[PDB]
Design a binder for these strands. Structure first.
Lengths: 189, 190, 185, 189
DNA sequence: TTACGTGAGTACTCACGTAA
DNA sequence: TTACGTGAGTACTCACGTAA
């Protein structure tokens, strides 16, 4: 549980207004209430601390993506749920969002970006999968090719999250989601 | 100035390389310009001002062409098309500056700078809101939702493409698939 | 304690040496302790705080000894003799710290520190002003005599510093006080 | 006049609040009106700039002191005059006073401070000389040794100078000089 | 786990060059 | 004399190291 106390505090730091700046191992140490070397007994480096946060984000998102594939069998509903999950997750975890948008990683090992790109590739592939199953489940397909649309949907989400982090979390992603979904539906249907 | 511009350029170039993902120290920048750190401060009071100048080029260059589009293109639908097609093309020809546009390169500098870029986006979205309201009130195009929701999605695709351009180390072109994207975004406002 | 006190000791030591006539950089101060520059910052947030640590010691030492003079010596003229003596003896026993009282060492540091030393002298002069009202002898003005007195002392501290610590502040104090006390009744 | 224009400028900055800190050549150039390369074709180093200021002070003061020996033949009056001359010069030159007390010399080459110690030595010798001539002139000497007395008199002056610069030029050196004198003569004579 | 600590860096400064 | 510098600092920071 100790190993989690660290990742949880690191997450709380990124959420606060301090998350906009470099989270020093000393400041992180003050949140956990332990010494600096007390952190380096669960994590070889600072980068492993982020690598663990990233894994968490991926775990939540992909798991829930799959749950939707089993729970819901209607194509449009599937896209709706995934779009909502992505924006809602970002809204409940502003600090983790700073890692998804890649701003918090600016101060860390530039290789962590590979994990971020692999996470996005999983979301995209998942999105693409849902769209492909339409002609089979409904007979109809989409105006644009599945790959293009998957990328288009993923782009709107990244853009939406970049604004969230940009505005200092003032611009909420899920606020007006219903009207937004109604817009996509009229576009995708 | 000659040497003054050599600085800004040196910066933009570094922002394009793989170093753009990490902090650009004055030591590294000085080397890239082939001068001493002191020479740097002779053209700029602080590292921040150096970035400001780049942002100044972005604000001017973008607001320049956006104004030209209004005096030239009058059709509300195509103006909206050219607006974002400009941002995507501008970012694609200025990879390094995109890191400023997405706000990643400005994490090592004064907050005040990021504000400068947030405003740049506020204005761009404000214009889109205008163009959409006119198309609705003058051409009676009954949208299935508020202009804010539409202008928000149009800006989302753009930022979505800027950030992904950065993620992939500039491998995924922001203008890629634009035409297809537009055929799905315009259908609800034609 | 162990290291925080060691640093303040190193700073005073350098302030006493020939290095005190020049800026005491952290690189150099760090070398005088046997540790790295980063090491200094674990006990002090700024170089300014290091100097405040010394200014506090100077204050605590001077003011507390002045309160002991009052409760031990009841004679007015002796009180005055003893206070001036304390100031000159303090500086003579602490060459480096005098470099601070004279204000030359603070030229390389935060302006607020010089503000502190002025505040300390006001205190000294005030307590010296109070004593002179216990009188008296020869049209005397408390406010004026107190300034002359603290002034004389201050002149002794600068002569001590600028003279590379050769002109001891307490030298000839007995003669100086002989002529003064006699004419001041 | 350019050489002098630099000296006045520097003198002026030493007289302002900036005098409390390092007077960079960059700023000295600004004040003068010319460039940094200009200031240097008139002065080899920055130390030559302060050296030329110590020279003004040295002559301003000794020439006056020698004139006193010649113009006044009463011992006490001779002492009164020199002490007044010293304090009066300081008061009229707040800037150069940051040099005499040595505070402004902390940013420059040590040599400059050894020269100041030479100046004070010439001053003290003057006093020590004026005092020795009392037995011959009046047949009476002082109740204290000429050395000790001289060192004490100059000390009062250095003290007044230190307070003047200290108080940001609020404590005037010539202030209440008359009271100090009334009590001094009373101690000697 | 805490005590005690540091190599490499980090934005910025200053008195003082030198070539045509 | 301009144009165009710079070697050596400066106070202060940080992720990660070593021994009890």
């Amino acid at each position: 549980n100790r190993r989690e106390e660290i990742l949880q505090a690191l997450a709380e730091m990124l959420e606060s207004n301090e998350g906009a700046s470099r989270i020093t191992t000393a400041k992180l140490a003050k949140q956990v209430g332990v010494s600096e070397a007390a952190l380096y007994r669960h994590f070889p480096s600072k980068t492993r601390m982020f690598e663990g946060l990233i894994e968490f984000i991926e775990e939540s998102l992909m798991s829930r993506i799959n749950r939707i594939f089993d729970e819901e069998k209607d194509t449009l509903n599937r896209i709706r749920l995934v779009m909502q999950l992505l924006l809602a997750f970002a809204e409940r975890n502003p600090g983790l969002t700073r890692i998804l948008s890649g701003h918090a990683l600016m101060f860390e090992n530039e290789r962590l970006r590979d994990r971020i790109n692999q996470l996005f590739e999983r979301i995209e592939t998942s999105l693409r999968q849902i769209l492909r199953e339409r002609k089979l489940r409904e007979g109809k397909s989409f105006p644009v090719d599945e790959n293009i649309l998957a990328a288009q949907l993923l782009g709107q989400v990244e853009g939406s999250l970049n604004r969230f982090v940009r505005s200092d979390f003032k611009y909420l992603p899920t606020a007006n989601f219903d009207e937004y979904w109604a817009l996509l539906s009229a576009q995708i249907k």
